[PDB]
Amino acid sequence: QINKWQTAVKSRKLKTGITVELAQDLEANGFDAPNFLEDLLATEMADEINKDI
Amino acid sequence: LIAFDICGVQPMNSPTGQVFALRAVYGKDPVAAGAKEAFHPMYGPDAMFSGQ
Numbered sequence A: 001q002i003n004k005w006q007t008a009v010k011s012r013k014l015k016t017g018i019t020v021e022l023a024q025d026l027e028a029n030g031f032d033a034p035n036f037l038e039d040l041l042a043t044e045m046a047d048e049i050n051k052d053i
Numbered sequence B: 001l002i003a004f005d006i007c008g009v010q011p012m013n014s015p016t017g018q019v020f021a022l023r024a025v026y027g028k029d030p031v032a033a034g035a036k037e038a039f040h041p042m043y044g045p046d047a048m049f050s051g052q
Helices: A020-028 A031-053
Strands: none
Touching: A020 A031
């Protein structure tokens, strides 16, 4: 006998929002500001994925 | 415009920068009330400090 196990894909969504002044201060202070933001969200999401799993 | 021909610029590469300055100071303690500046342009030298 062959049965099936199915489910829809569900979504997760995060946002940050960094002002231009903050991005400028991050660059001045040695941080890669555009990558910093992406790492923040990507890391936070990946962590939340691990929590979910 | 008058441009900036009448002032310094020293553009920043970081917000909120700072400027230091050096004063030559005499009287055995560079940081003390009454200590004097050795090369001050208005005030004369202590002409006998190293002498009599």
